[PDB]
């Protein structure tokens, strides 16, 4: 008795998702495709952000990913940045960015 997750070639919980879809009351019924498809999308996305975060950790010479890393990853990618243009990642801080005209000297 395999799981639908495995049957779909997935890491995320297909059953759980198909379950929440029901309890979230988004429609009278939910076809077996939706949950499979939605767990996939969910999984794909977490991977993309973890890839990017993981690098930031590496860049800052750390092993454990922390909120800042998540933040640096999101604000540095055009897309994850748009996908989350109104999300506030707690303890993430902002990206280092000083306006030119605020720097000294001349050249």
């Amino acid at each position: 008795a395999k799981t639908r997750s495995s049957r779909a070639g997935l890491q995320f919980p297909v059953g759980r998702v198909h379950r929440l879809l029901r309890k979230g009351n988004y429609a009278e019924r939910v076809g077996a495709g939706a949950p499979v498809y939605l767990a996939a999308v969910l999984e794909y996305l977490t991977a993309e952000i973890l890839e990017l975060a993981g690098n930031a950790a590496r860049d800052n010479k750390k092993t454990r990913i922390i909120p800042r890393h998540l933040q640096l990853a999101v604000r540095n990618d055009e897309e994850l940045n748009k996908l989350l243009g109104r999300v506030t990642i707690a303890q993430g801080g902002v990206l280092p960015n000083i306006q030119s005209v605020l720097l000294p000297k001349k050249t």
């Binding site: 909120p67 707690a90 303890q91 993430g92 801080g93 990206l95 280092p96 720097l103 000294p104």
Partner: protein, 99 residues
Amino acid sequence: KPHRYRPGTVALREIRRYQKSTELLIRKLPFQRLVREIAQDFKTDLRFQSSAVMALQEASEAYLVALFEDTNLCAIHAKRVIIMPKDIQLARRIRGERA
């Protein structure tokens, strides 16, 4: 004779400093009070999970930091470097908070 940094040399160091960290920049206790004052003058006898007071602080500084960036730009737009109330006001107007 004694060493003295010019104005804005320290500011840049602070921008670089603070822009590099993520710790909350407001005294935690004073903030809890303000939260409790406001909450209370809306409904008496209320309690707070510590996490709730923290979520508010996180939200609030995140908001102010972002608002200061907009302000900074608005000032710069006016060919200045010293932000002023009018800058904050222009930003909030375009943002749709007091249009």
